Symmetry: D2
Subunit: 295 residues, 4 copies
C-alpha cells in the first residue's frame, strides 16, 4: 500500500522500517532531516512537509510526542489535510490525551476525513522487532481496513471497540500498571523490613487477589453480580490494613498508597458498608465519582 | 489427638467442628457460652476458662480477634499457661500484629512452652468445608508435628519457613490484596467515566503487569536481577500517570492512590532515577525506608 | 499541698521542680532512679513505687509516655489506687488516647476516686520556666480545685469544658499542627524550586488564610453560618491546586498532602459542590464521615 | 491612560469598571458580547477582537481563565501582538501556570514587547470595591510604570521582586490556603466526632502553630536558623499523629491529608531524623525534592 509516515523517532523510525520490509511504499516526513535520510536509505521517499507526504497516500500514520504536535501536523501550515484524499485513512499511533484524540477525530470528520486511534504498548525494542501491542480504536470498518498495515508493526491487535477507545484502554491499562508498581514496592519493602524472604510472599500472593488481581477473582461473583453479601467484610479488611500500617510505621517503611487506601476503607465504613464484601469498594468509588449506585 | 480450641467465632467454630469430624477430642472455650454449647452438641467437652481447656491437651489452638486477646488467653487470669504441659504445642491461627506474635512465642519459650503461628487465608465458607489456606509459621519440627491436625481445617499448607513467618506472609498478602482493591476500583471507575466497557480493559490488563502484577513480570529480569536499564522509563511512567490524573480530575473520578503514586514517581525523578526502568521504584521505596541500595 | 508525682522525664522533672519551688511537699516515683535522685536533691521525698508515693497525698500527678503506663501506674502492682484517699484528686498530664482517658476516669470513679485530664502544650523549655499551656479537662469543681497547683507548672489555663475534653483538645491541636508542618514544607519547597524568596511568600501569606488559617477567616461567615454561597468557588480552588501540582511535578517537588487534597476537592465536585464556597469542604468531610449534612 | 482590557468576567468586569471610574479610556473585548455591552454602557469603547483592543493602548490587561487562553489572546488569530506598540506594557492579571507566564514574557520580549505578571488576591466582592491584593511581578521599572493603573483596581500592592515572581507568589499562597482548607476540615470533623465543641479547639489552636502556622512560629529559630536540636522531636510528632489516625479510623473520620503526613514523618525517621526538631521536616522535603541539604 501507499503510506505516509510522519514522526520518525525512537518508535516511529522502526515502525516505518517494518512497513518498508513488508513491501509498502512510504513517503516520510520528520522535522529532523537526519531521521528522514535514515528512512530514505531503507527505501522511503522523502517529503518536505506533511501535505506532500499525504498526497496519494492510502494510509497516513502519525507517531508524535503529544496531541498539540498531532494537531499541527494534521491542521497546521502544509498539514496532512492539504494533501489528504476523502478515501484515505489517518492512523494516529501517538499516546495523547483521550479528549484531544476525540476532538482531532471530530475535527477531521467535519472536513470529510477519516481518522482512527491506534496507540501501542511495549517498548522501542518491540517496535524494532514488530512485536508491539496494537490497541486499535476506530470503527469496525477502519480496524478491518487497517489490520494488514498494523500487523507489520505489532504481533497482537486488540479491538478496543470504537473511535477513541484505543487511547482510552491504553490509558486505563497504563494507569493501573504504573500505580500498581508503587503499591507492589510498598508490600515488597514491608516484606524485607519483616525479614520474610520475598519468594515466600510471591508464592502465597500468586494464589490470591494480591498476585492475581481482583478484576477476575474477588469481583465477578460479588460486586459485578450485584451481590455485596460478605466473603471478606470491609470491617476486617480495614482492621488488617491498620495492622500493616502500624507495622510499617514502627519499622519506618513509608507506605503512602497503603495509608491512602485505609482512608478509602474508612469512607466506606462511614457510608455504612462495614459488613459488606470488600468488592463493595468498587461501588464506594463509583458513588464518590458522582455515579448512580448499582447495588 | 487431644486438642484445646479457644475462640469459637465465624472461623473458630467451623475449624473446631472439622477437628471433631476427623475424630479428635476437643475441649473448647469461648466467652460466648452459646458458641461452647454448639460445639458440645457436636461432641466437644466444655471448659470454663483457657487453663481448663489446655489441661491434658497436646495441641492448643487460638482463633481470636487481636493480639491483646491472644495474650490475655495465654498469660491472663486462668490463662492457657496455668494448664499447659511442656510437651504440648500452642498454635495461634489468629491474624495479629507480627511483632506481638514474636513476643508471645518468646514469652512462651521463656516459660518452657512451644508456640507457632499458623494464620489462614480464604473465608468462613472455606472454614466450614475445611478448605482454608494454612500459612504455617514455626520451626520445621513444629510444622511437621502440627501438619496432621492442620489438614483437618485446611486443604493447602504453605511452609512459611520459620517462627513468625506465617503471620508475616499473611500480613504481606492481606496488605497487598486489601490496598490493591482500592487501586483496582479507581482504574475501573475511570474506565466507566471514559465510556470504555470494563471487559475490554480487563482483556488488555490480563496480558500486562496491570492484570498479572509486577512481581513475576516487570521485576524479575530488571530490578530483581540488578538491571535498571529502561524497558519503560520512570520519566515516561510519571508523564502517563499525570495524564491519567488530569483526565480523572476533569471527570471528577477521585483517585487518591493514583495521586499518591505520582508523588512517589516524582520523588524517584528527584533522586535521579528518571531514565531508569520503572522497576527501580522498588529501589526508591527501599532507600526511602532507610535500607541500603542494592543497584 | 501534699503531692505525689509519677513520671520524672523531660517534662515531669521540671514540672515537679516548679511545684517544689512554690512550697508543695512532693513524694516522687520514676522507674529511673537517677530522675528520683535529682528531685530528692531539690527537696522531694523519694517513694519506692506509685502506692507509696500516693499515701496521704492530696493531688496525684502522672506524666508518662502512654495510656498503658498510666493504667499500670494507677491500677497495677503497687499502683496509686493502693495508697489513694477518696478525698484526693488524680491529674493525668500525659498525652494519651482520649478513649483510654475516658475509661481511666470511669474506672477510677467506679472505685470512688476522682481523676481529671490536664495535658499540656509547649515544650520542655516551657516546663522548666513554668510557662506550659494547661489544657484542663475535668468537671468545673475539679478545675477550680486543681488550678492553684496547675498554675505552678503553666502560665495559661484553658478550661476545655469537661471530663476528657482536655485530652480531646490536645489531640485536635497536635493533629492539626503536626500535619500542618508537612503541608507547610511542601509550600516552602515549591517556593524554593520556583526561585521565589521565602520572605516574599510569608509576607503575602501573613495577610490571607494561607498564613492566618481558615478557622477564623474563610469559615465563620460561610460554612459555620450555614451559608455556602461562594466567595471562592470549589471549582476555582480545584483548578489552582491542579496548576500547583503540575508545577510541582515538572520541578520534582513531591507534594503528597497537596495531591491528596486535590482528590478531596474532586470528591466535592463529584458531589455537586463545584459552585459552592471553598468552606463547603468542611461539609464534604462531615458527610464523608457519615455525619448529617448541615 | 489608554487601556485595553481583555476578559470581562466575574473579576475582569469590575476591574475594568474601576479603571473607567478613575478616568481612564478603555477599549474592551470579551467573546461574550453581553459582558462588552455592560462596560460600553459605563463608557468603554468596544473592540471586535484583541488586536483592535490593543491598537493605541498604552496598557493591555488580560484577565482570563487559563494560560492557553492568554497565549491565544496575545499570539493567536487577531491577537494583541497584531495591534501592540513596542512602547506599550502588557499586564496579565490571570492566575496561570508560572512557567507559561515566563514563556509568554520571553516570547513577547523576542518580538520587542514588554509584559509583566500582576495576578490578584481576594475575591469578586473586592474586585467590585477596588480592594484587590495586587501581587506585582515585573522589573522595578515595569512595577513603577504600572502602579498608578493598578491602584484603581486594588488597595494593596506587593512588589514580588521580578518578572514571573507575582504569579509565583500567587501560586504559593493559593496552594497553601487551598490545601490547608482540606486539612482544617479533617481536624474540625475529628473534633466533632470526639464531641469537643469547635470553639474550644479554635481558642487553643489560635495560640499555637495549629492556628498561627509554622512559618513564623516553629521554623524561624530552628530549621530556618540551621538549628535542628529538638523542641518537639519528630519521633513524638510521629507518635501523636499515629494516635490521631487511630482515633479517626475508630470513629470513621476519613483523614487522607493526615494519613499522607504520617508517611512523610515516617520517611524522616527512616532518613535518621527521629531525634531532630519537627521543623526538620522542611529539610526532609527539600532533600526529597533533590535539593542540596542545608
Ligand atoms: N518510547 C516508549 O517506550 C513508548 C512505548 C509505547 C508508546 N510510546 C508512545 O510513543 C510516543 C513516543 O514517540 P517516540 O518515542 O518516537 O518519540 P521521539 O521523541 O523519539 O520521536 C518524536 C519524533 O517526532 C518528530 N517531530 C516532532 N514534531 C514534529 C512535527 N511537527 N512534524 C514532524 N515530526 C515531528 C521529532 O523530530 C522526532 O523524530 C508517545 O506518544 C509515547 O507514549 C512510547
Ligand atoms: N472472618 C474472616 O473472613 C477471616 C479470614 C481469615 C482469618 N480471619 C481471622 O480470624 C480471627 C477472628 O476470627 P473470627 O472471624 O472467627 O472472629 P469472630 O469475632 O467471629 O469470633 C471471635 C471469637 O472469639 C471469642 N472471644 C473473644 N475474646 C475471647 C476471650 N478472651 N476468650 C475466649 N474467646 C474469646 C468471641 O466471643 C468470638 O466467638 C481474626 O484473627 C481474623 O483476622 C478471619
Ligand atoms: N516532650 C514533649 O515535648 C512533650 C510536650 C507536651 C506533652 N508531652 C507528653 O508528656 C508525656 C510524658 O512526656 P515526657 O517528655 O516527660 O517523656 P519522657 O519519656 O522523657 O519521660 C517519661 C518518664 O516516665 C518514666 N516511667 C516510665 N514508665 C514508668 C512507670 N511505670 N512508673 C514510673 N515512671 C515511669 C520514665 O523513666 C521517664 O522518666 C507524654 O504523654 C508526652 O506526649 C511531651
Ligand atoms: N473569581 C475569583 O474568585 C478569582 C480570584 C482571584 C483571581 N481570579 C483569576 O481571575 C481570572 C479570570 O477569572 P474570572 O473569575 O473573571 O473568570 P470568568 O470565567 O468569570 O471570566 C473569564 C472571561 O474571559 C472571557 N474569555 C474567554 N476566552 C476569551 C478570549 N479568547 N478572548 C476574550 N475573552 C475571553 C470569558 O467570556 C469571560 O467573560 C482567572 O485566572 C482566575 O484564576 C479569580
Amino acid at each position: 500500500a501507499a503510506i505516509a509516515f510522519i514522526g520518525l523517532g525512537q518508535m516511529g523510525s522502526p515502525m516505518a522500517s517494518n512497513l518498508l520490509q513488508q513491501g509498502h511504499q512510504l513517503r516520510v516526513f520528520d522535522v529532523n532531516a537526519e531521521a528522514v535520510r535514515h528512512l530514505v536509505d531503507k527505501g522511503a521517499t522523502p517529503a518536505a512537509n506533511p501535505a506532500q507526504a499525504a498526497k496519494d497516500a492510502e494510509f497516513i500514520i502519525t507517531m508524535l510526542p503529544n496531541g498539540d504536535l498531532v494537531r499541527n501536523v494534521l491542521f497546521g501550515e502544509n498539514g496532512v489535510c492539504e494533501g489528504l484524499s476523502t478515501d484515505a485513512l489517518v492512523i494516529d499511533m501517538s499516546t495523547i490525551h483521550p479528549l484531544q484524540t476525540d476532538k482531532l477525530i471530530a475535527d477531521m470528520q467535519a472536513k470529510g476525513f477519516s481518522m482512527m486511534d491506534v496507540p501501542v504498548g511495549r517498548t522501542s525494542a518491540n517496535a524494532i522487532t514488530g512485536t508491539l501491542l496494537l490497541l486499535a480504536g476506530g470503527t469496525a470498518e477502519q480496524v478491518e481496513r487497517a489490520t494488514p498495515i498494523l500487523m507489520a508493526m505489532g504481533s497482537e491487535l486488540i479491538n478496543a471497540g470504537g473511535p477513541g477507545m484505543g487511547i482510552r484502554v491504553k490509558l486505563i491499562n497504563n494507569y493501573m500498571s504504573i500505580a500498581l508498581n508503587a503499591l507492589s514496592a510498598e508490600a515488597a519493602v514491608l516484606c524485607e523490613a519483616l525479614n520474610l524472604p520475598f519468594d515466600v510472599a510471591v508464592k502465597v500472593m500468586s494464589g490470591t487477589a494480591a498476585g492475581k488481581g481482583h478484576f477476575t477473582t474477588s469481583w465477578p461473583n460479588k460486586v459485578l453480580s450485584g451481590d455485596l453479601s460478605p466473603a471478606f467484610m470491609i470491617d476486617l479488611a480495614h482492621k488488617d490494613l491498620g495492622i500493616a500500617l502500624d507495622v510499617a510505621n514502627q519499622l519506618h517503611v513509608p507506605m503512602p498508597l497503603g495509608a491512602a487506601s485505609r482512608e478509602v476503607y474508612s469512607q466506606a465504613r462511614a457510608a455504612g458498608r462495614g459488613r459488606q464484601d470488600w468488592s463493595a469498594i468498587l461501588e464506594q468509588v463509583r458513588v464518590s465519582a458522582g455515579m448512580t449506585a448499582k447495588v
